[PDB]
Ligand binder design. Structure first.
Ligand SMILES: [Mn+2]
Ligand SMILES: [Mn+2]
Ligand SMILES: [Mn+2]
Ligand SMILES: [Mn+2]
Ligand SMILES: [Mn+2]
Ligand SMILES: [Mn+2]
Lengths: 314, 314, 314
């Protein structure tokens, strides 16, 4: 199979600057060279160049709506494209709002995809529930059908089409859910596993369940939107919104490992790595490396080891 | 329901000074303001002013027996009082010897209460088994019926009445048990879950069992005596007796979360936070915050999120 | 039963210097005094003095083959000796190549011993698969029968006799396995538990299985070759090859605790503690202490507590 890396240097999803430098760091850490060393064909599509919407006024609270809608519009296009040619797409973050784009384009080509969202937050606030207008905290609201018409059309997102229903998404690692957001996920009966659940069930049973819950009936394509903040800050320090008491490096890799084992990985998102927010070089290198690590996991790299087939090492 | 906070500025339970500054820090961290934000009525009763027994000579090894017996006698009184008015009491530590008082007063009003003791130590040494005379390491021995008459009447505790039996208490997080103490908990067949058990069973099954074990027959009031030392030192550094390889921040919150879910929380103890023992501001703030956090957990605050009923966030 | 401590100050197993200072640190931390405090007879055999083979030229890639073969030859001798007198041997590392010696001597006296290898690495590279000639990464290859003749005789190991088969060893905590090494452990069908397994099954079930797998039929002597690198670097920092996402202090102690509980402990290896590789005093003391701790665990020390029999602490 083919693997296509698409850098999305974007950050207007939220106020903190730096995230755009994200895909650069990941590459510098050698994500591509390493990926090539797996059983997959690696094609680096490069870094999208986003056009900045001049005079992008705040639609109510929502900030930079037009810039974020144009950034995402453009991505969904590139993603739909490579997805069409049969290659798995791997979007490197800036912030998480690029998920609207990533998930959209992919949805075009595979409308029956299910989404596994590993993150500390739900990011399901609507333009009417956010406290800040940071669109990085509203991604899943633009993609959800059940939430269509539940909020006023946003300047620039007119191209968006609610592609999945609350019965196709599964959250893992939740621990900082705004009140509104909690209502939304309870009302729509969305399947999640808050940290408390991971604690109660153990990362193992968690996957076991998320799978039989998303692939019990039909075996469909899987979209992994992994928000590097879903791991405890100790592991991924250089982030915009760290929240303590989260997934461990081990648990993180177990998810990507089980996901690889299903062979249904269709699209990936390695978002929120902010090279500038490291309190020391270590913290950033630390973050950038577990990010690069989680990815390689989705594509083979097993912790027990890997040997090349048809070769007798004896 | 009503919630009443009672600060117990005491520290003669053990040699290290500072713990009395405990309830102050917790408040400074805003325990009250936050508590108010939950579905409970918060009443701050203030900080008990303890009278210091002049010329309190060591009854054998037991140190400051009269001061500690007067401190606890006074608390049990305030606790019995508010417990009577139907409010849940939440005692902020100084040291853990204040538990004799806390558990006693509460027992008066609800003699059928069971006690869940989350701690690094058993604290079940009798005046005849301690190595030091620190009464903070003997609390459960004054409350236990099975241990009545097993030791010399202590100067000042004459008011105490063994209110519970070894069949009403459950330990969670044990890892530093003196030889004598181990004998005592084995002989009396007390139900506990040493770290090794948490490890073998997982915090999940642990609660599942401690509940069917304490609430299988009758559903009675629960007394949670939480010793901040029960978490690994990494999480609650500013303590008098850190012991490595203990509960994680996650596990800690899981217990308080499952306890809230039973709706039987009758009384709480947030003990051993010692603002002065922090090797850096961080460590204390770190400690003080996970303490404040565990509390809010017992009273609603779920990690998956919380939304106010009857309100349509859409 | 008797306990015999044998210090092996060796380090030519790998390029990084310092590991020889290993057994010294452990002793300084008071391993012996503490061990004495358990229900075992402690005899300190001292520190072997290794003769340095002059002009030890590299056999192909394998470095210091003669020095390492003489170091191990000598150890196997001392170990076979004390093992003969019926005492349990406890070898303190330098590097892990001393395992050839340790396991060999022991095998002489108890040819039916099974080996539990707690380590981050497999250390099963043969002189023909290593990238470096560091023999510390080849120990299990010299001891395995199935790998006999699979590589050219090495200068100094002529005395070695493949004592165990791939059906007697069990790995726990694997996470950094070279490609060759992975082939070897897959081809020979060796039973292991890579971190992913620990994650999936939980340290509890892991032991439960490793036991019924090694002691289901016959109850034989157990050799515990514990490589301090098997725990996450956070816990045992001062090592030559740290690899993140490994066993936790808790899990580590759980293994040594379950192993003690089988009563079949015949020989031990506390290897890779490198006092000089600590980035600060703390890190080394931290490392040296969890090492000393794991040992005491294998010999009684329970986390729930220990009391001396026939003594009424009341
Ligand atoms: Mn997110
Ligand atoms: Mn997030
Ligand atoms: Mn205590
Ligand atoms: Mn304690
Ligand atoms: Mn090793
Ligand atoms: Mn190793």
């Amino acid at each position: 199979k083919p693997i296509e890396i698409i850098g999305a240097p974007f950050s207007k999803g939220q106020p903190r600057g730096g995230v755009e430098k994200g895909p650069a760091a990941l590459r510098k850490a050698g994500l591509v060279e390493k990926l090539k060393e797996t059983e997959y064909n690696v094609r680096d599509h490069g870094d999208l160049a986003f056009v900045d919407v001049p005079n992008d006024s705040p639609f109510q609270i929502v900030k930079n709506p037009r810039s974020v809608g144009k950034a995402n519009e453009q991505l969904a296009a590139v993603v739909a494209e490579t997805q069409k040619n049969g290659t798995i797409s791997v979007v490197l973050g800036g912030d998480h709002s690029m998920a609207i784009g990533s998930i959209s384009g992919h949805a075009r080509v595979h409308p029956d995809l299910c989404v596994i969202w590993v993150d500390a937050h739900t990011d399901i606030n609507t333009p009417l529930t956010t406290s800040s207008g940071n669109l990085h905290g509203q991604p899943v609201a633009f993609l959800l059908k059940e939430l269509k018409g539940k909020f006023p059309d946003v300047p620039g997102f007119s191209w968006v089409t609610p592609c999945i229903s609350a019965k196709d998404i599964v959250y893992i690692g939740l621990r900082d859910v705004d009140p509104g957001e909690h209502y939304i996920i309870k009302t729509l009966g969305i399947k999640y596993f808050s940290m408390t659940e991971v604690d109660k069930l153990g990362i193992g049973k968690v996957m076991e369940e998320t799978f039989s819950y998303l692939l019990g009936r039909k075996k469909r394509p899987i979209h992994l939107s992994f928000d590097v903040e879903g791991l405890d800050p100790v592991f991924t320090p250089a982030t915009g919104t760290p929240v303590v008491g989260g997934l461990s490096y081990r648990e993180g890799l177990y998810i990507t490992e089980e996901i690889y084992k299903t062979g249904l990985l269709s699209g990936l998102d390695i978002m929120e790595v902010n090279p500038t927010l490291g309190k020391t070089p270590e913290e950033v290198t630390r973050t950038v490396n577990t990010a690069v690590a989680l990815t390689l996991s989705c594509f083979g790299t097993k912790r027990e080891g890997n040997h090349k087939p048809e070769t007798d090492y004896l």
